[PDB]
């Protein structure tokens, strides 16, 4: 469950789920730990 | 275990330049450093 600014590793998430893995294999610049790679849009509310 | 962590640190140190933008289909670090791209296949492989 990637939900927070922290606690959202793609290298963890795309190994349990294959759907994130084919998402990252098509968009490899979201595999970065540094900024925010996108949460689900109800979870991704940065200004709130 | 230290050699595996060393290779982790090398990946960090030359994955500094990681920015959320693709241009054609490649991430920007694939544009930056030829060590992070498809073209640098490497010398030894066992499957493909």
UniProtKB/Swiss-Prot annotation, chain A:
Span within the parent record: 914 to 961 of 1345
The protein's name: Major capsid protein
Function summary: Self-assembles to form an icosahedral capsid with a T=16 symmetry, about 200 nm in diameter, and consisting of 150 hexons and 12 pentons (total of 162 capsomers). Hexons form the edges and faces of the capsid and are each composed of six MCP molecules. In contrast, one penton is found at each of the 12 vertices. Eleven of the pentons are MCP pentamers, while the last vertex is occupied by the portal complex.
Name of the gene this protein is made from: MCP
Subunit field text: Homomultimer. Makes the hexons and eleven out of twelve pentons. Interacts with triplex proteins 1/TRX1 and 2/TRX2; adjacent capsomers are linked together in groups of three by triplexes, heterotrimeric complexes composed of one molecule of TRX1 and two molecules of TRX2. Interacts with scaffold protein; this interaction allows efficient MCP transport to the host nucleus. Interacts with capsid vertex component 2/CVC2. Interacts with the small capsomere-interacting protein/SCP.
Coiled-coil region: none
Family from the record: Belongs to the herpesviridae major capsid protein family.
Subcellular location: Virion; Host nucleus
């Amino acid at each position: 469950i990637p939900f927070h600014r922290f606690f959202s590793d793609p290298g963890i998430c795309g190994t349990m789920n294959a759907d994130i893995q084919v998402f990252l294999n098509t968009f490899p610049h979201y595999q970065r730990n540094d900024g925010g790679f996108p949460l689900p849009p109800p979870l991704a509310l940065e200004f709130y | 275990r230290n050699l595996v962590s060393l290779i982790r640190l090398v990946k960090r140190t030359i994955s500094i330049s990681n920015i959320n933008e693709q241009l054609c289909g490649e991430p920007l670090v694939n544009f930056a450093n030829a060590l992070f791209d498809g073209r640098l296949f490497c010398p030894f492989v066992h499957t493909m």
